[PDB]
């Protein structure tokens, strides 16, 4: 079975740059080679078929080339909405096989996060658990640090965090952190704070509440 390789594994570029990704077959596949675009959570989408034919409705800034064992896909004016993983796929011999994919990310101006904090709901409190949630919205680059502080004392070991994929419109990220305590423990302290550091901020930002 034909092994399909792709390089680079990922790349970063800015809006308007021209980007070229490559695909190699282990042996000759003529031009029996297709390209798919996929964004996280979504199904793949066919972009180029037979190495160089645009599927109907694909923007003209996409183009593909090659024949035999080496193939390329090229985007000429990278747009925010071109953020995705791109897969190549051969159909010359059975069974058809896919490459491992190349991830295209986008650079943009530094943007500091907006920071919000949510106390636990009473619906959850009566069940005996208290989750406190800190939201970092629409920032860039993706590197950011959140620290939880209870009565001004830093915490460890009771929080979890998760960052979104890059936004296809404004090229930013968001981040959600949750601090989970027992109702007993939660009710023994006063002030709850998340402290946020990010290259867009010269000093760490703190959002807090009492109770």
């Amino acid at each position: 079975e034909i092994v399909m390789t792709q390089s680079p594994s990922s790349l970063s570029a800015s809006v308007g740059d021209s980007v070229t990704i490559t695909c190699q077959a282990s042996q000759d596949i003529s031009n029996y080679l297709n390209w798919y675009q996929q964004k996280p959570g979504k199904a793949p989408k066919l972009l180029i078929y037979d190495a160089s034919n645009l599927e109907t409705g694909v923007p003209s800034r996409f183009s593909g080339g090659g024949s035999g064992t080496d193939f390329t896909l090229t985007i000429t004016s990278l747009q925010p909405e071109d953020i995705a993983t791109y897969y190549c796929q051969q159909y010359d011999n059975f069974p058809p096989t896919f490459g491992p994919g190349t991830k295209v990310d986008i650079k943009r101006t530094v943007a500091a996060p907006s920071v919000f904090i949510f106390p636990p709901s009473d619906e959850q409190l009566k069940s005996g658990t208290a989750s406190v949630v800190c939201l970092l919205n629409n920032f860039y680059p993706r590197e950011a640090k959140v620290q939880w502080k209870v009565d001004n004392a830093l915490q460890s070991g009771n929080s979890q965090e998760s960052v979104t994929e890059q936004d296809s419109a404004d090229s930013t990220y968001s981040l959600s952190s949750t601090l989970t305590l027992s109702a007993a423990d939660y009710a023994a302290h006063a002030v709850y704070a998340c402290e946020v550091t990010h290259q867009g901020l010269s000093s760490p930002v703190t959002k807090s509440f009492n109770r």
Partner: protein
């Protein structure tokens, strides 16, 4: 008007059996080369099987013997019978249409997630993330829903039955130390109209066929 929509996915014990369905609209399965293709971390996208218009079926080596692809033309639905499931069969399964029988996969469904494990399904609890003076900035207000303690993946969340999509961020789930998942979904809206608009998160966990609509009220 032309789409594919898969169903049937969820939790299955090793050696168990599952049946996936895929309903087509805008075309007839009986005159099209339909395929199943799965995706999981590690092996990436993997072709699984196909059924030709005339009726020939072919299978990948890794599922030969265990899976069976079929279609009912009356319902225009396509099926994948899954027997003797193994750990490595955990994946998102997509049905896809092709032309020419030379395999292009021109149209794909949403995908359906099959998790092979010996654990038990658990449906989530949903708690509001209410807008307050600690979640407002420059005329904008943040609010959300916290979807806590479920297994397996996935949880999907809509706002206002699909009518609110601007400004929404549904975060990848995290794995809690209990082996259970938790996720949050948030939206930013104008502060000035919190008193007049209504915001409801719609949480669907199909593996435990659970549905919750939670109104999120300002504090």
């Amino acid at each position: 008007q032309v789409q594919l929509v898969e169903s049937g996915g969820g939790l299955v014990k090793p050696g168990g059996s599952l049946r996936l369905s895929c309903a087509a609209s805008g075309f007839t399965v009986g005159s099209n080369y339909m395929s199943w293709v799965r995706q999981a971390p590690g092996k990436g996208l993997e072709w699984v099987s196909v059924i030709y218009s005339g009726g020939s079926t072919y299978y990948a080596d890794s599922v030969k013997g265990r899976f069976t692809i079929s279609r009912d033309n009356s319902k225009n639905t396509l099926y994948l019978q899954m027997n003797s499931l193994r750990a490595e069969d955990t994946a998102v399964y997509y049905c896809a249409r092709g032309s020419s029988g030379a395999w292009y996969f021109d149209l794909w469904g949403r995908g359906t997630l099959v998790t092979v494990s010996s654990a038990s399904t658990k449906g989530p609890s949903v708690f509001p993330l209410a807008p307050s003076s600690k979640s407002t900035s420059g005329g904008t207000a943040a609010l959300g829903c916290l979807v806590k303690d479920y297994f397996p993946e996935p949880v999907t969340v809509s706002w206002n039955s699909g009518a609110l999509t601007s400004g929404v961020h549904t975060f990848p789930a995290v794995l809690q130390s209990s082996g259970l998942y938790s996720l949050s979904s948030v939206v930013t809206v104008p502060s000035s109209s919190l008193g007049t608009q209504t915001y409801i998160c719609n949480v669907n966990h199909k593996p435990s066929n659970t549905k919750v609509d939670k109104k999120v009220e300002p504090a």
